[model samples]
Target: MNTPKEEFQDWPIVRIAAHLPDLIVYGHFSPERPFMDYFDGVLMFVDISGFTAMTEKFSSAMYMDRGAEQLVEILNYHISAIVEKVLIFGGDILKFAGDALLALWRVERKQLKNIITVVIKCSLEIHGLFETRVKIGLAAGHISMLVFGDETHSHFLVIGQAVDDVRLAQNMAQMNDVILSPNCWQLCDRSMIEIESVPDQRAVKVNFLKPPPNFNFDEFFTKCTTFMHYYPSGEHKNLLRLACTLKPDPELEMSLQKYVMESILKQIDNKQLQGYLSELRPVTIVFVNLMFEDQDKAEEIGPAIQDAYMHITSVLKIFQGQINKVFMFDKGCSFLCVFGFPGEKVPDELTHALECAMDIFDFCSQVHKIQTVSIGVASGIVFCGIVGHTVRHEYTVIGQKVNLAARMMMYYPGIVTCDSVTYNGSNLPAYFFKELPKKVMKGVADSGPLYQYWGRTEK
Candidate 1:
């Protein structure tokens, strides 16, 4: 029997596929790994809408098997023919994922446009042939080849996150519509192609790339991080939940697993973030707000993220780059930054604490486009761990400090504020600690008053 692994099969999904090989898993495209590793390239997926509801609506104990086969066949013929065309240009059709189909193309970015165009044209023809409407989304990226089951056989699986992103792009679309990545759009040499839909998705912010955009990192590396971030919100809980059963890793579900710093990829390419430099100076923890941004506001992509990253570097008063945790509560709307990882002196902790408050003010006014970001800084002991079930866990810090800092965020007039918790709790430099007047609040004991924090020692 042929067993499947690798999501579309990869470490994250294969972990789950190993346990339940017979069940219909919905998080990805392509069927349970049905074939041996026969191809050298990826089996890209193009998911047609309406498979699940159709199955549930029409499925009966009697018709279920044939229903699946018929659905598979109807979608497959058109997809298979398209894969043949891809083969003409040196690609292969690997497998069919019921409504969506997968194709493997050998050549890299060079043929992306042609590949999509052919798929689109073939799909349109099939739309007429079937007398049914199906909206389509096309994403073509590479995945790694791995041996998930029998060691003697290798399977071509979508790895990293490009596959995850493509699948998201497909799901984000509407009926009969297609959406391609901005890069895929650039590769098109044909004018017959058209993009019918741009999704209205929460947090699916549009990113316009600069012309002649210089590639800064290997696509796989960035995809890894992108994959990490894909399932955090909404129904994708299954994707990560499945990741846990496969094997044990320290930071499986933490931001470390998911947040792919695109800037880090580019800067790493520029060699700016790389160095032999030692961490000898004070480290800074910074938080900045990119909140309530006007719908028309024009800002560089990832700059809000980079803005927070940069401020931390500057505040540390050290030249080399360093930041521990960069937390965005709900996208750019809010943040909670922290520092003091493996290196840095303990005495500098006080300075780092103070600088965090100052950095928030400076970043909001200068870079983050805000008057202020209600701020909080804490210094003391805190415990960190993965709290949820093995399948779902978060890398988090705990203690009175964590609670105080978080509560502090509520004190700002800008819907961002810091509470008097810091001033009352810490024995940092006396002059640097400034407290706003306290007031009684409805919730909690209220300590009789809640004061906001103003950031550090002397200058």
Candidate 2:
């Protein structure tokens, strides 16, 4: 008596199908439709700690055909559980990289601290599950959210320094440990975190944020059991739970028939909406470069150079900024951070940019005491988009502001320097900023005033 679509209207997967447009990837973004922006929040990576060795062990012990099937089954089992926990805790599953799973939670910078707390709770939950021996890495910042690839094989992705930091964190952590980068750690309530002193490179070399005392491992599995009871099949219940939390975007929702068909089409060929943008938009650019005062000691620069990238990039994630470029040389390393690109959900980015720079200062002071970095930030309009042939493409930005931001970093070492624009945006009286006299930057005509962030304004 009823249509097939009507029968499953309340189904979780069917409900998820309607939001398909929000989660597809593409290779080409035509000028006619550019749908890329900067997404600000946290990027979390969870995966099997010894995936390669475990997979190899299974393969060697069994027949090739049987080994392949068994390997997939093991991965699938883990991935399914991970995916469920991710959704339950208000995250969007971006994609799975082999045994590793990646997801993002786009929340306001104002509430960034608490959201990270929630994400950490989920991380502990996933890690404690006996069925999956996994490690998690959490980092926060602005990630490039875009549609990349082609019709046959498009993908939806959020990427940038934040994504990179989390991946490194998870890979570097001990199995079942919920590793947090310095940036991620800073965003949480200090009382909630616990840091252990380790007299080893594993501690010094890699910055890991320990989970809080309040985070309960068994509590999550208990919740999952209750969740599983309702949806015996364990399909889309997580999605359903998340939907209730979001503000109703009526326009984004649709009937079961439309999304169900759309979901089927995606399974066949996960393409994306074609789009591109070249318009001028307000952007804040942060440039960071690590420098060793004793430049003559070229040999010492080798390992410290690698260490510099790790320290600053980890801090950048907390601010929701993107690492546009990295330059390595005899002196040290350089990083270019963009505030607005990939996704534009997070507002008041200048504050996040400055906060990110300050964290880098602390990271260098505490972790890499032997190293110092030059940080600079500028806010202005710039072009944000993707440009390349079908074979390869990249998301980048360009403008005078971009160059000026770099010049600020080049001239000012061992501190965060910013153009007048960025300083103006940071009106919070809590921060102490020293106004630097105007100076003409390289390759730029204007000699705008600059400011150096001293520290938080004394109460």
Candidate 3:
């Protein structure tokens, strides 16, 4: 007699559904069918400044008593207000990158004009909410949206020129300002708003005028709310209801634990993991960039991508490292890994991070499909924890060190480059590194000497 197979098919879905945006959870996105499409939309990136300073202040011994609580309180107050404004304007938050939020308003070519107006209005309102603490960037263009990966592990990615344009716009923005890309500025209603051109930067700053555009805020809000309430199909309602009512299952949690780091899993087991909680800690960051010859040829590169992921993950696990996030861009994919997070300190975390980076470089070098593998290692204090609303949140590391590591990754190709902190902290022999001349790194104000890791010196 054959024993009946257990059915836990929806377990993973239920667990991950909570962490996803409403659009994906409400049946607008489907993984079973190929969900690749060109999205013509207005993208807005709202980045909060002064957060790093705030984190540092709270981490000091004087304020370490209840700093996490106060920080979370302040962050949620501002971010929740921003999220509400985005939702009221029919925008969907794509993801949260630490203190920054990426939101999208999907629209057709014909509706681009009106949608851009609405997005600008929303941006202005969000600026009013946070004032000088927020920097808003807006862009409009075609985005390549696709869901990639197998059934067990999948990622929804939005990539294209628009994504890059949004970042550039954000970089151009200053406190209390809304910056727009050239294309986005062109699409705006010239009569309804005022803007000053930054010709050298190829961006425009939206000046806060006395009376904003002539759009009907009430109508737009009502329409957005009505559509959200009624758009989900009957089946979607049932799935959502089921997902909400289902009790936690130990077996399912155990299976899903593989995706989370051991330290985080331990916190959950101990019931110490609170939503929106963050802390400042010293962490060794390992940023890896995998460049392929041709990303458009998915059929040829898909297997290689999987193989690379498996090898990278396996090595990280062996070194007690955690894959914080994997970012897939138009040309290549990159991931950030961290050591010494979410738990007790590991005295040798820097060594582990450097060794892991070297292993990843050597392994990826053998993969003929990958044109280049760039790894960057840095050690510093960062704000680490779950960020965002209770419904949709992610564990991330944010600070100057994180930026430094990512910058180091881009400085060279096909090798591991590390900042001075990581190099000094590592126990590796002197032969393992070759010093490089100092160079200016964008987004990183203070950077020390850089080193290139050759490889391991086995005894």
Global lDDT of each candidate = 0.38, 0.54, 0.68
Sort the candidates on lDDT, descending order. 3, 2, 1
Query: What's the lDDT of the predicted structure labeled candidate 1?
Result: 0.38
User: In model 3, how large is the Cα lDDT of residue 68?
Assistant: 64
Clashes of each: 15, 25, 0
Scanning candidate 2 in windows of ten residues, the lowest lDDT window is 386-395
Candidate 2 off by > 4 Å: 1-6, 9-35, 49-54, 57-64, 150-153, 197-459
Candidate 1's displacement at residue 47, Å, is: 33
| TM-score per candidate, chains pooled | 0.35, 0.42, 0.78
lDDT per residue as tens, model 2, 197-224: 3243232122333556576645744443
lDDT value, residue 146 of candidate 3: 53
lDDT of 3 at 14: 53
Q: What are the per-residue Cα lDDT tens digits for candidate 1 across 102-155?
A: 444443445455445444544454344436345544445544332121111112
Q: Which candidate is the best by TM-score?
A: 3
lDDT of 3 by residue, 302-401 (tens): 5566667767878876866777877654356777888773324343667677778888888887776888889988887787766655434556677778
TM-score of 1: 0.35
Supply the TM-score for candidate 2: 0.42
Q: Model 2, 40: alpha-carbon shift in Å?
A: 1.5
